[PDB]
Write a protein that holds these residues in place. Structure first.
Motif, PDB file in Angstrom:
ATOM      1  N   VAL A 204      20.253  -7.212   6.688  1.00 39.77           N
ATOM      2  CA  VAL A 204      19.793  -6.450   7.847  1.00 39.77           C
ATOM      3  C   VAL A 204      18.312  -6.119   7.704  1.00 39.77           C
ATOM      4  O   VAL A 204      17.525  -6.279   8.646  1.00 39.77           O
ATOM      5  N   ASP A 242      22.234   1.801  10.185  1.00 42.28           N
ATOM      6  CA  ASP A 242      22.485   0.380   9.948  1.00 42.28           C
ATOM      7  C   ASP A 242      22.710  -0.378  11.250  1.00 42.28           C
ATOM      8  O   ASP A 242      22.259  -1.521  11.395  1.00 42.28           O
ATOM      9  N   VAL A 278      27.662  -6.142  11.012  1.00 38.43           N
ATOM     10  CA  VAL A 278      27.474  -4.992  10.121  1.00 38.43           C
ATOM     11  C   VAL A 278      28.748  -4.163  10.059  1.00 38.43           C
ATOM     12  O   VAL A 278      29.183  -3.734   8.985  1.00 38.43           O
TER      13      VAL A 278
END
Ligand SMILES: O=C(COP(=O)(O)O)[C@@H](O)[C@H](O)[C@H](O)COP(=O)(O)O
Ligand SMILES: O=C[C@H](O)COP(=O)(O)O
Ligand code: NA
Ligand code: NA
Ligand SMILES: [Zn+2]
Ligand SMILES: [Zn+2]
Ligand SMILES: [Zn+2]
Ligand SMILES: [Zn+2]
Ligand SMILES: [Zn+2]
Lengths: 292, 293
Positions: A204, A242, A278
């Motif tokens: 990420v 995130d 994610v």
């Protein structure tokens, strides 16, 4: 279907796994979270902050989630007010159809935090809604946690053990007080909540930087710390940063690679996919995959 | 509240104004369109393409619009399927709660276009849903065909080809619409008419997009003056999508450029909503639907 928060978290508590609690601010985030839960056969905790509620309108926040739970009726879903700041906010969320509310009074002294939490619990329990509260800022006193849970009758507790919100959690090396966590769990015997639990995975981060983004010396909670937290009794793992980074990385990429692109779907379809991935990986890490 | 498309467009037809039909693909676009309608006291025609429906899911498309109409119950709102390509697509939209559907069979010969449109109309009218169809392709509309097509199909509103096309790149040179053909169509059909590909690409929107590093590739919209003349000639529904996307994405690009550390979605989409809302507000005033609630 949409259920009381404690229904999902009591199971995670009894069986020793963690359920990610995923924030959303619009349709794209919400759709990706649900698709992740469908693909990993995982229960969902969906969270909306007060700021997200202001942005969407509480009627749309609840309404979109209800549409999504009818689309995936086999998935246990709780809709949770993240960091409610007043009794009135929690009460509005209860009235609108939230099935879990958090009252954050951890900046008050113990007695005032307990009083306000207890007021929220009475109101929410009368409506069949579960309640989260927070203790610690300074880290949690486990003996305070024990009394606080007994007297407030709160369903789950966020004990401060070293995390913080945002992409910049550790000025140095990541460090969480797992001995304190275990003591809180032993004394309270309820589901526990980890705030500020984003990890900023390497892939990420790499996507964000490749897209021209700047992550100003950021550092999240290592995957190993999240797993150790669950081993210690954490059952709800709050995850927002995130998701944002992965989503916005793809938006930036599309903007960079085609200056004539203005179809919103061309930006947000890859953004959804990255967010979904994610979430799927986090569900596997925390142990909620294949728990439906 | 949520009403049949013809409720909004018959009023516009009788009083001689145009109602923008604004496409959406998500919550941000929809919220900005509704706030524009509230601020200008204008009826709302909300449109979703087949591609938008696939992206949102038809349950979410209808569901979000119903939430928005309950938030603003004084605003007449129609929810319209834009460029339905098959009977089955139109039927799915009817079943899901759309109040207007368009069947685009204009690439067929007259007889086949009329047959399919009539099938859609029978199905939609039985469910209390209004219907749009299209005539002309490029070849412009034959007004006498329009007259017979409307009489036989019983369609509620018609999109006659008079010189527009979709996207940002509409005119290879100077904009040109056949207003004499429009007036003949209007006179012979006496129903509300629809203008497709009606974005204007205003100067400020183009400038915002270019300032943000975008490239519009020499795109040209319909000048404001041509939109007003089209309403004067009988256009009552004005399909608008491209202008909204450009204004919205210009702000997204700008935020990305000016702060590489920004990843709060709301910091990107709040200014994008505002820019889209302002495009809609100005278009409602231009077309004459402001203060018509
Ligand atoms: O702990 C949380 C997220 O942790 P994270 O930053 O993802 O490590 C949430 O409970 C936050 O309170 C939430 O993300 C805040 O959202 P906004 O207030 O910015 O909407
Ligand atoms: O005219 C129809 C729509 O503007 C096209 O939109 P779409 O790109 O979602 O198909
Ligand atoms: Na929370
Ligand atoms: Na249409
Ligand atoms: Zn928190
Ligand atoms: Zn938090
Ligand atoms: Zn907190
Ligand atoms: Zn068209
Ligand atoms: Zn067309």
């Amino acid at each position: 279907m949409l259920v009381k928060g404690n229904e999902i978290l009591l199971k995670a508590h009894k069986e020793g796994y963690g359920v990610g609690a995923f924030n959303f601010v619009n349709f794209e985030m919400l759709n990706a979270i649900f698709e992740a839960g469908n693909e990993e056969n995982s229960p969902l905790f969906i969270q909306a902050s007060e700021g997200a509620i202001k942005y969407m309108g509480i009627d749309m926040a609840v309404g979109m989630v209800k549409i999504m739970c009818e689309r995936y009726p086999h998935i246990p879903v709780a809709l949770h007010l993240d960091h409610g700041t007043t009794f009135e906010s929690c009460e509005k969320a209860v009235k609108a159809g939230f099935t879990s509310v958090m009252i954050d009074a951890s900046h008050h002294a113990f007695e005032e935090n307990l009083e306000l939490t207890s007021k929220v619990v009475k109101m929410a329990h009368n409506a069949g809604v579960s309640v989260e509260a927070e203790l610690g800022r300074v880290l949690v006193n486990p003996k305070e946690a024990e009394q606080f849970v007994k007297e407030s009758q709160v369903d789950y507790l966020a004990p401060a053990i070293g995390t913080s919100h945002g992409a910049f959690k550790f000025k140095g090396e990541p460090k969480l007080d797992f001995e304190r966590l275990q003591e809180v769990k032993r004394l309270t015997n309820i589901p526990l909540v980890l705030h500020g639990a984003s990890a900023i995975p390497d892939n990420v981060r790499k996507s964000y930087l490749d897209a021209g983004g700047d992550l100003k010396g950021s550092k999240g909670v290592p995957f190993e710390f999240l797993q150790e937290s669950v081993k210690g009794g954490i059952n709800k793992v709050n995850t927002d940063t995130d998701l944002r980074i992965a989503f916005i990385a793809e938006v930036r990429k599309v903007a960079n690679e085609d200056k004539s692109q203005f179809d919103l779907r061309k930006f947000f379809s890859p953004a959804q996919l990255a967010l979904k991935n994610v979430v799927k990986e986090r569900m596997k890490l925390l142990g909620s995959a294949n728990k439906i």
